[PDB]
Amino acid sequence: AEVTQLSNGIVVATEHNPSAHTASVGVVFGSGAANENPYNNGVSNLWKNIFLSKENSAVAAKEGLALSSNISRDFQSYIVSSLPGSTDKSLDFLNQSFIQQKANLLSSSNFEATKKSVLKQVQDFEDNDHPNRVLEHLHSTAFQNTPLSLPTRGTLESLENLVVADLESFANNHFLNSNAVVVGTGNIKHEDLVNSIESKNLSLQTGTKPVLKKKAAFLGSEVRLRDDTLPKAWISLAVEGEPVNSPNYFVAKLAAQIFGSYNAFEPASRLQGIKLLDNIQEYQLCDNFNHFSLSYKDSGLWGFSTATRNVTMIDDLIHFTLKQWNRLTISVTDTEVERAKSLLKLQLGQLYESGNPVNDANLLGAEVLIKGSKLSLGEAFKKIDAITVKDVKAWAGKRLWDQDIAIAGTGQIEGLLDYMRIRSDMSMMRW
């Protein structure tokens, strides 16, 4: 009714839904693709993909289980999904996979069939998924020589250099209990799981903490992947944003909300009450964009992302947009702010209140790791609404106005201008 949180060594967390047809259990390791290193990159995405190799996934397929997995930057998750009654059928199959079995998934016929498929995997991504590719490199340059930089799915380089002796090197350090959280989502009780958990003995590497690295940092920089053979142009730009559990966590998400997200095709999109939109549409400066305030444990990235078949006029594209961003400091309409608060809520909803347990897991697992607990929607909303204009005019005033940016891109970006232009559009001339 307010989400449960109790620890007997294994911090056991759950979240009940009485109208759910199914449920899900799993673990979340409080160390992700940003706890790795330059040459072991993709180790966390390698771990995910053995966990779903036909072997272990045929086991749980007779049982009636489905497994879910994802790696982030600050965190890393291993979830299993099934019918709510077969709730022990989950917990046991989890127990087998992470304390019982070890080299049953770590075969020299398994691992050389997973790594020979996480290699094709990260060779369609950087090959044909430019919007994320661009998005990923954006981190690489903004957070260069620092934790967040390492692409979550790992470089094809440090991904052909890795054997099983390396899957473990990360496992036995960062796959602990004092870095994990067990989650219960969907259609199960707190007294169903934490019972079935204290039912099982053993302890893996107790007392052990996972290790640390130099805290992340940010620096104004570019990286440009020109490719004049690609029909469009993809660009992503940002400033040093705000972390998870930062005073302006919501203030910053409200700002993103204002300019928001465009799709020049859906007539619905064309009518949004966004000021910037007035400009961009005249000549069709782009095909779409969208904003964001990506928050991570140590640092953040407020900016936006755009694709465009309009090559001669990208220079305006970036211009109109970064000028709008100036208003946030000097001239944002209050009535804009309300449409923000309003729309944030709708978005922040379909995020948190989707009828899909697997999401409510990672969400829970990550948050109850970093701050300890989760924060309720009513808590969030109570904050969103407190937000004045002055909220947004002092946040932009430090974060946005005349601060270093972080551009990245690919496709026909000859037209995308230089760094002393772009960066300079962070401000406006004053008397």
Binding site: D402, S427, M429, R430, W431
Partner: protein, 57 residues
């Protein structure tokens, strides 16, 4: 130029067009002050003022 002594006045923004013109206005008196002094001194004894001094009629 020291990051403290600058940022005090101007925090993290440049000079502003009008503050410039203000400084300009001030500088222009402060300068023509100094330089006209240093020059009248450097040429002491030589100036008609210094020569008006001794010479009587």
């Amino acid at each position: 130029s020291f990051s403290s002594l600058y940022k005090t006045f101007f925090k993290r923004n440049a000079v502003f067009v009008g503050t410039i013109f203000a400084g300009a206005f001030v500088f222009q008196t402060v300068f023509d002050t100094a330089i006209t002094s240093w020059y009248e001194n450097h040429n002491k004894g030589k100036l008609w003022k210094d020569v008006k001094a001794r010479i009587a009629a």
